[PDB]
Amino acid sequence: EQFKQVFKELEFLGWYTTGGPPDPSDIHVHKQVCEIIESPLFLKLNPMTKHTDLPVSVFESVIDIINGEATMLFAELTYTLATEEAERIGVDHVARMTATGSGENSTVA
Amino acid sequence: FSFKKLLDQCENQELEAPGGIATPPVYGQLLALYLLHNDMNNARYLWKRIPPAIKSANSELGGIWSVGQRIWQRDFPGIYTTINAHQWSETVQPIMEALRDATRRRAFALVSQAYTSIIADDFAAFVGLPVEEAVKGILEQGWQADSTTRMVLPRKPQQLARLTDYVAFLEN
């Protein structure tokens, strides 16, 4: 109700988390979110990554017809990086500047 | 490197003396070596340092000073004559053989830099050899020479560590 007053034509899409590969707890939280919206997304950032690809990974729920107990799985997705004019200007300004140091460490560091 | 090892060997021998006076050949070597290094002020003071009694005793010392007087006035055509007026024994002779070459190369550098046109008569007296350079210089070194007027025309032919030292000083 708060954000509906400012962003009028914007709606709930999913949720996000920080961690490594998807965990079972992520599946329970996805089940909980599914009660709010029919088809929720699932973003996942990995601040502890150790490689040169963007840690952000977008998943999507899939319901299986496995015999006996019924389970739900995550299917990966391919995402774009669309930006608007002001967002692009701000991101360029933030990433270009390097005078960010403060504290004990030298500016050389 | 090898030559420098012999230079400092003779330096200290004069300082330690049984009576403040060293052997005559040690005095002569230092005076001749000073000429080779073009250090004229210390060569002049060394001559003033030698006592008059030993100075008159050995005329070999005087022969070094007569040459030194000419090079002190920068008399290039005259030094070549004083270096041959006397005869130096083989013990000091090789040093003179190197001073003559040093003077010869000094004239070559001075002429090529301070002169745009020089008479062949004067240039020969500078370099020291008016014997065979008259014909050899035209075709080998490329200096165009004109006869009759006798004019020679000389022609002209790790950091990152230092920078971070500056910043580490300025910021602290």
Tracing tokens 């699932």 back to the chain, one arrives at A42
Residue B107 and residue B104: Cα distance in Å, rounded? 5
How close, in Å, is residue B159 to chain A by CA atoms? Answer: 15
- DSSP code, position B86: S
**CA nearest B164 in A: which residue?**
A108
Residues with Cβ within 8 Å of residue A40, at least 6 apart in sequence: A12, A13, A14, A15, A30, A33, A34, A61
* Rg of the Cα atoms in chain B: 22
Resolution of the determined structure in angstroms stands at: 3.2
Residue B135 and residue A21: Cα distance in Å, rounded? 89
Tracing tokens 């971070």 back to the chain, one arrives at B164
CA nearest to B124, candidates B113, B137, B140, B114:
B137
> What are the residues facing A42 on neighbouring strands?
A15, A59
Contacts of A106 in chain B (CB under 8 A): 167-168, 171
Residue B13 and residue B117: Cα distance in Å, rounded? 47
Q: Looking at the complex, does the CB of residue A108 fall below 8 Å from at least one CB of chain B?
A: yes
Contacts of B168 in chain A (CB under 8 A): 106, 108
Helix residue ranges, H only, chain B: 2-15, 24-36, 40-49, 52-57, 59-72, 76-85, 93-114, 120-127, 133-139, 159-170
Residue A90 and residue A14: Cα distance in Å, rounded? 25
Give, in order, the Cα–Cα distances in Å from A68 to each of A27, A51, A64, A65, B162: 19, 39, 11, 9, 72
Give the number of C-alpha atoms closer than 13 A to the C-alpha of residue B116, restricted to the C-beta side: 0
Helix crossing, B24-36 with B93-114: angle to 10°?
A: 20
Residues with Cβ within 8 Å of residue B92, at least 6 apart in sequence: B25, B28, B29, B32, B60
Judge: B164–A107 Cβ closer than 8 Å, yes or no. Answer: no
Q: How far is CA A17 from the centre of its chain?
A: 7
**CA nearest B167 in A: which residue?**
A108
Residues B115 and B154: beta-carbon distance below 8 Å:
yes
Tracing tokens 């290039």 back to the chain, one arrives at B76
Instruction: Please tell me the total number of residues recorded for chain B in this structure.
Output: 172
* Rg of the Cα atoms in chain A: 19
Specify the experimental method.
cryo-EM
Dihedral-angle region of residue A85 (phi above 0 means left; psi in -120 to 50 means alpha; beta otherwise): alpha
How close, in Å, is residue A98 to chain B by CA atoms? Answer: 17
Tracing tokens 């040459």 back to the chain, one arrives at B67
DSSP symbols for A89-106: HHHHHHHH------SSS-
DSSP symbols for A19-87: SSS--HHHHHHHHHHHTT-SS-EEEEE-TT--SSS-S-EEEEEEE---SSS--EEEEE--------HHH
